[PDB]
Amino acid sequence: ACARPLISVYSEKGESSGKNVTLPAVFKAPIRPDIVNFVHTNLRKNNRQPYAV
Amino acid sequence: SAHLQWMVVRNCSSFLIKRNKQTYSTEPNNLKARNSFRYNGLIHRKTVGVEPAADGKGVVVVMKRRSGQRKPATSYVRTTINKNARATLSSIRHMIRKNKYHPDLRMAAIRRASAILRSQKPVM
Amino acid sequence: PSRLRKTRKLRGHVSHGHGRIGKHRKHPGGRGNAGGMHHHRINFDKYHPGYFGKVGMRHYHLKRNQSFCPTVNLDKLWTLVSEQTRVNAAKNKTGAAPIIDVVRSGYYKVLGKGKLPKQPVIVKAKFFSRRAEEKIKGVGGACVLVA
Amino acid sequence: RMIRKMKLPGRENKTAVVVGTVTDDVRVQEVPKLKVCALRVTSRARSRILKAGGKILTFDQLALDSPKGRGTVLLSGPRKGREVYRHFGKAPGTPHSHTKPYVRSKGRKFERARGRRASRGYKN
Amino acid sequence: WRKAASLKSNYNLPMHKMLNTDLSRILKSPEIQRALRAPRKKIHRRVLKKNPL
Amino acid sequence: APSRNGMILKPHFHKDWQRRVATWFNQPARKIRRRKARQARARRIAPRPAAGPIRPIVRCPTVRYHTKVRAGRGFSLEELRVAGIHKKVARTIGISVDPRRRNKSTESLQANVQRLKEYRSKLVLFPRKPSAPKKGDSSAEELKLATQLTGPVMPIRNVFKKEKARVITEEEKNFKAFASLRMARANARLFGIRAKRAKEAAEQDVEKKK
RNA sequence: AGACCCACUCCCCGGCGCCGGGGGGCCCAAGUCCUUCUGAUCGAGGCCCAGCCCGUGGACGGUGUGAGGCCGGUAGCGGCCCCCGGCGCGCCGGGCCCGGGUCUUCCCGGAGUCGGGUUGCUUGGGAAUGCAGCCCAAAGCGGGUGGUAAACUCCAUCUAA
RNA sequence: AGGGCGUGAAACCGUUAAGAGGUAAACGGGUGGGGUCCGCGCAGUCCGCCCGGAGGAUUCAACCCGGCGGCGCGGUCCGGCCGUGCCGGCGGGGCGGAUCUCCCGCUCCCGUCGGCGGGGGACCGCCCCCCGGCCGGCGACCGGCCGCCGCCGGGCGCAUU
RNA sequence: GGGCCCGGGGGGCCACGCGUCCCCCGCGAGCGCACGGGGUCGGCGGCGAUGUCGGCUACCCACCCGACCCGUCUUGAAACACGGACCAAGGAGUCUAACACGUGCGCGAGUCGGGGGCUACGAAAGCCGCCGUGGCGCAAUGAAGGUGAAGGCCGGCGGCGCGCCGCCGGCCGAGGUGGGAUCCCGAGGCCUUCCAGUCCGCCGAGGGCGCACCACCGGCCCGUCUCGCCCGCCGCGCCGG
RNA sequence: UGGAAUGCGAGUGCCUAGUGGGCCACUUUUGGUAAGCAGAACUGGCGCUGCGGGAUGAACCGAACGCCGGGUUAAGGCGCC
RNA sequence: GCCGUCGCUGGCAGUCGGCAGAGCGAGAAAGAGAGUGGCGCGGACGCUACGCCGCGACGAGUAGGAGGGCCGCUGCGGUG
Ligand SMILES: [Mg+2]
Ligand SMILES: [Mg+2]
Ligand SMILES: [Mg+2]
Ligand SMILES: [Mg+2]
Ligand SMILES: [Mg+2]
Ligand SMILES: [Mg+2]
Ligand SMILES: [Mg+2]
Ligand SMILES: [Mg+2]
Ligand SMILES: [Mg+2]
Ligand SMILES: [Mg+2]
Ligand SMILES: [Mg+2]
Ligand SMILES: [Mg+2]
Ligand SMILES: [Mg+2]
Ligand SMILES: [Mg+2]
Ligand SMILES: [Mg+2]
Ligand SMILES: [Mg+2]
Ligand SMILES: [Mg+2]
Ligand SMILES: [Mg+2]
Ligand SMILES: [Mg+2]
Ligand SMILES: [Mg+2]
Ligand SMILES: [Mg+2]
Ligand SMILES: [Mg+2]
Ligand SMILES: [Mg+2]
Ligand SMILES: [Mg+2]
Ligand SMILES: [Mg+2]
Ligand SMILES: [Mg+2]
Ligand SMILES: [Mg+2]
Ligand SMILES: [Mg+2]
Ligand SMILES: [Mg+2]
Ligand SMILES: [Mg+2]
Ligand SMILES: [Mg+2]
Ligand SMILES: [Mg+2]
Ligand SMILES: [Mg+2]
Ligand SMILES: [Mg+2]
Ligand SMILES: [Mg+2]
Ligand SMILES: [Mg+2]
Ligand SMILES: [Mg+2]
Ligand SMILES: [Mg+2]
Ligand SMILES: [Mg+2]
Ligand SMILES: [Mg+2]
Ligand SMILES: [Mg+2]
Ligand SMILES: [Mg+2]
Ligand SMILES: [Mg+2]
Ligand SMILES: [Mg+2]
């Protein structure tokens, strides 16, 4: 959880443009499928429209 | 890691089939289509896959290389083997035991290979 | 969610979990806090002593801004200034003590809980407790009053 | 609390272990060199421990360093240090019960007249 | 991890609860493997009781 | 009916509260509308500042807030008079006026007087007739740089006078903070009765004297 | 208002002519290509390397299923045509003959209302928060308020009818 | 699908077929007999190795060429990125600081001397970028040579394989 | 009878090397049968394509044993207790607010932007930080005025007569007793031809540091009471500590 | 020499529903001529509970219940049903 | 015999293979320890660890509580 390799940048022709970017730290952050499901569950309720008889 | 990735997909995967009190995995390089940590074909650094060749003759043995783990384009080495039945199995046994490449999948790979070759014989 | 609640498991069970004998009637015992000095006296006496009666003077038109007086103890006193403020003062030699102005931090009175590090300090506040001033004086500091 | 319990005689160079969170204490002035294993350490507690020269571990690192837990000092936070336990015990309206009542407000008018002073009915 | 977020007023990456998630490397490591008792993998099924008399 | 230990609750739902529920489902649509009226107003008065007239500094009342300053309603007539701005001309050039407000102390008066003079120094004034400048108007060179201002004009901020470490004296070390406070409360509490006793005492002895 | 200084020419009204958001109408990409299932199909297969064609348009509806490409539409700081509006620029006839600082002398306020008693309602407003009836009924450094009735006394704060 | 016409349930009814019928019917357990259908049964499984007969071939092992891959404590190969590592930096900078500190705007005082507000600079903590030294990963992170092994393609092996 | 059934002059022993000292007088190899860690046969027979084989359950019928009609109130229902002729569709613990405890997640002496603002799905999502005002938490206590959360030791002086109180300077320091998961030391001890003595491990009498928690005893803060002697001063007080 | 036998792992904290009509039997027992009456104690039951026996039956006797095969019983029985 | 529940808070990461050596159920503490001197290329299944395996006990139920439903219904985000 400390490796930050170099990521290629590809040209529009689908080839490695020779440039590189170090992998951002955010891609090493903990993967929490339950924090995601909690957050997705509750945020998706926020674009609802009320219904009532 | 494999164990971390297995905890994300053990019960949430497009390849997961739950039906008739059974469970299967339809992803490539799973030797038994089994929703198992051992036989999952995506989460490990070293995986073995056996498929029928594009034409119904011989099998294709897929091995995951060690370097390009994050590079899907060049991660799998595919070898076609179209010898007789006993020679096809002998190659797979050596491709696994001699290289010490996931030795715990030796018989699953050999059992899967015998099943593809059998299915390529003329039907009666 | 309603799928996780008792109602779903109570389908098919007559009485819906309220009993066959006592049933679920509308308001047995009264509505709200009825019966405090009556059929509900034990609960009130047992769990809410002091509930009934009157105590103390009335004060019409209380304005809670007049008694605003946030307090800070001495054990938290040095957090009101940065860390380098304390280390610089502790290691300097001229004997100069830093000024901690608790009003700037949103406090008025200084209380005495805790102990101070052996480091002189000048404290500014509207109010002090007697033990706060002694403890502040025990480390070589002084208390400064502001209006 | 961790500094106090790790200062008892004969606990030098022992790794403090807590299955939980290590929170910072602003009331502490000097932080000694600690080795700690915790589930979580607050952002400010982490800086203070390291700036003092200590070492922070995870529990997967305690195993590779102390597989059997040797040289460890297992520690726990105050379990009764919660507001709820101020409400447990003899009901507030019984003799010598120092239980905290459940009131919506605190002040002269809120449960202090009858049952709490002899001048109003009684006290216990 | 070393540098707080620049475009968020006060934010930093969430800390890892488990730094090495490779459970197989941990378990197979020499250090843990020295502390273990030998496995007891022999199965002792039920013995049918025969009458000694 | 109460059940074991529990708070005694007095919900205020004994009226027809359902007839007067105010939902907030129009909140995002209100926020858009308010913003759209801020933009059309900013375009309408440009290059005048979108925020509005410059407000003064004032100290919040009560002892809970008097350590803080904020934006007041408008500058007072004494402030404008000392700053040489006509009260009726003040509103025309972006300055707010508050005839009600009184200046009790000089320092607060001066702070707003200086605030006005700083504002008058930043004012870029366009001539009434664009082709016919006049006495007070800004030069044509600095009109090409006149751009609308966003946010409150000269925002008001609470600044603290930092004091450096100084060696504590024996006079300060000797000061008694608690005793000084307790005696001060006593003196301000017994002042009226003490003065009464002194007056009566003189009367009692005087009749003995004369 | 008078005096001494200082500074002033654009501000609007009725007409008249010229110049740069809103409503209505009409329009603007691409398969009905080749086999094929069907009562009919919008279905299925295909459409060279490349990948049928358009795509800022793959919302939706219609059409004998199930349609980006058959039609209407959809996208577009797209096109054209009418009308209303707004914002600017000039002319005619009008109105205004306009301001600031300091001194000097002057002038300045809402009454059957306030306030008081009592009654009824009302309020969280408690020796009475507000309102109303009846009685009493003002003052002018006065009057109102200053959340406990009242006298004496300072303060603060506004200026009702 | 025949104009209250999509589908067309249940109750209830007509008829056809089968079975049965004096303790109302119905029901549980246990068999039995008869039907409707199903096995799309009716000379009964399949697989590995071995032995033997008949044959038949993109003929085996071993060798050579080429490609690919795994591993190497290559006891210490070269090149690399690279340490949420540690040391030395005249290193070139950002962030923060209730750590200190020549320039300026306004103001009190006589052209002088002070206060507020606005700016450098030093300092400290952290971070990024540059250079040298140790150990250090490359299993969330690789290339070149060498070695071993494995696999495939092509030769050669032409037959007790 | 008991004394490995004491000692002396035909029938069963889970007796069977020896140097010795002397009480007394550390590995043989095979093979095989089995009352031996739960069943096998390395045993057989008949029938089989147009009327026969298998088909639990399922349709109809029969017989034997069993068998009162449900829901409900009720001590007690098959009841001569009430609802129920039959079939379809509909039909009853919800939502809002408040509170309590439990659980999960985030951050943590803090935490929360919910109101406001900025920048098709989107009325969403993202940002604010001199938007954290504010809420809850971080301090209690008293009707209130108000007050508001450890000490000891050393040296000197002062008052009383070695001890006490008031005052000055240096040292240590957030209590203790009992139990207490875990952790720590380690008498002794864990074998291979035999002796010595090492490296890593491991068991362990006894002894320690002792988490949380509980019981107990101290202490500290606010209200009240009783007793009592002092200390401060710009205000010498019906003052303050 | 953990200082009688026997048996058994204990302690502890929160939240908590339904109930708050009961009725019956051995023994003891109050009122009443008595009652399948009214009222108590102890234990056990029925209520909430099927099952073998008492022909039949809330409580009696035996015994308490996962779906089964074999064996043996209890209380009760063995002319025929 | 079989089903389930409960308990053993039981066992399995040791699939440690020709870079090899198969064990730790056994009456009675702790090492199948490490040293220094005196031909073939072969070896079943397993491990959705929320999984798999073993052993022992047990199983009445109204009011009521709790758990699990790969029980069923309608719509929404993903996926097939
Ligand atoms: Mg039930
Ligand atoms: Mg009911
Ligand atoms: Mg209930
Ligand atoms: Mg009830
Ligand atoms: Mg209710
Ligand atoms: Mg209740
Ligand atoms: Mg259509
Ligand atoms: Mg097509
Ligand atoms: Mg369409
Ligand atoms: Mg198409
Ligand atoms: Mg079109
Ligand atoms: Mg359009
Ligand atoms: Mg008026
Ligand atoms: Mg009324
Ligand atoms: Mg009322
Ligand atoms: Mg008053
Ligand atoms: Mg039809
Ligand atoms: Mg139709
Ligand atoms: Mg119809
Ligand atoms: Mg019809
Ligand atoms: Mg019919
Ligand atoms: Mg018939
Ligand atoms: Mg019968
Ligand atoms: Mg019958
Ligand atoms: Mg009923
Ligand atoms: Mg009855
Ligand atoms: Mg019934
Ligand atoms: Mg009857
Ligand atoms: Mg009835
Ligand atoms: Mg009826
Ligand atoms: Mg229905
Ligand atoms: Mg409750
Ligand atoms: Mg909670
Ligand atoms: Mg929308
Ligand atoms: Mg009742
Ligand atoms: Mg009775
Ligand atoms: Mg009775
Ligand atoms: Mg009942
Ligand atoms: Mg019972
Ligand atoms: Mg029973
Ligand atoms: Mg009988
Ligand atoms: Mg039986
Ligand atoms: Mg009989
Ligand atoms: Mg049960």
* Strand residue percentage of chain B: 15-25%
| Intertermini distance of chain D | 37 Å
Shape of chain D: elongated
N-C termini distance of chain B = 47 Å
Lateral arrangement of strands in the main beta sheet of chain D: 3-2-1-4
Helical stretch tally of chain D: 3
Structural class call of chain B reads alpha+beta
Query: How much is the radius of gyration of chain D in Å?
Result: 22 Å
Total strands of chain D: the figure is 4
What profile does the largest beta sheet of chain B have?
3 strands, antiparallel
Characterise this structure.
The structure is cut from a larger assembly and holds 2 copies of chain A (53 residues), 1 copy of chain B (124 residues), 1 copy of chain C (147 residues), 1 copy of chain D (124 residues) and 1 copy of chain F (210 residues). In chain B, 28% of the residues lie in helices and 20% in strands. With 124 residues, chain B is of the alpha+beta class. In chain B, α2 packs antiparallel against α3 (106-119). Chain C has a 3-stranded parallel sheet. A 3-stranded parallel sheet of chain C has the order 3-5-7, with helices on one face. With 124 residues, chain D is of the alpha/beta class. A 4-stranded parallel sheet of chain D has the order 3-2-1-4. Chain D starts with a helix and ends in a 50-residue tail after the last strand. Classes of the chains: A alpha+beta (53), B alpha+beta (124), C alpha/beta (147), D alpha/beta (124), F mainly alpha (210). Chains in contact: A-B, A-E, B-E, C-D, C-F, D-E, D-F. At the C-D interface, α2 of C face loops of D. Chain F binds 5 RNA strands through residues 3-13, 17-18, 21, 25-29, 31-32, 34-35, 38, 86, 110-111, 113-114, 117-118, 121, 128-129, 132, 135, 155-165, 176, 178-180, 182-183, 185-187, 189-190, 193-194, 197. Chain C: This is Large ribosomal subunit protein uL15. Chain C: Keywords: Acetylation, Cytoplasm, Hydroxylation, Phosphoprotein, Ribonucleoprotein, Ribosomal protein. Chain C: GO terms for molecular function: structural constituent of ribosome.
Q: What topology does this entry show?
A:
The structure is cut from a larger assembly and holds two copies of chain A (53 residues), one copy of chain B (124 residues), one copy of chain C (147 residues), one copy of chain D (124 residues) and one copy of chain F (210 residues).
Chain A: E1 6-10, E2 16-22, H1 33-43
Antiparallel strand pairs in A: 1-2
Chain B: H1 2-9, E1 16-19, E2 22-25, E3 48-52, E4 59-64, E5 76-81, H2 85-97, H3 106-119
Antiparallel strand pairs in B: 1-2, 3-4, 4-5
Helix pairs in contact in B: 2-3
Chain C: H1 6-9, H2 41-47, E1 71-73, H3 83-91, E2 96-97, E3 99-101, E4 109-111, E5 122-125, E6 127-128, H4 130-138, E7 142-145
Parallel strand pairs in C: 1-4, 3-5, 4-6, 5-7
Bound molecules: magnesium ion (MG) (44 copies).
One magnesium ion binds at residues 15, 20, 23 of chain C.
Chain F binds five RNA strands through residues 3-13, 17-18, 21, 25-29, 31-32, 34-35, 38, 86, 110-111, 113-114, 117-118, 121, 128-129, 132, 135, 155-165, 176, 178-180, 182-183, 185-187, 189-190, 193-194, 197.
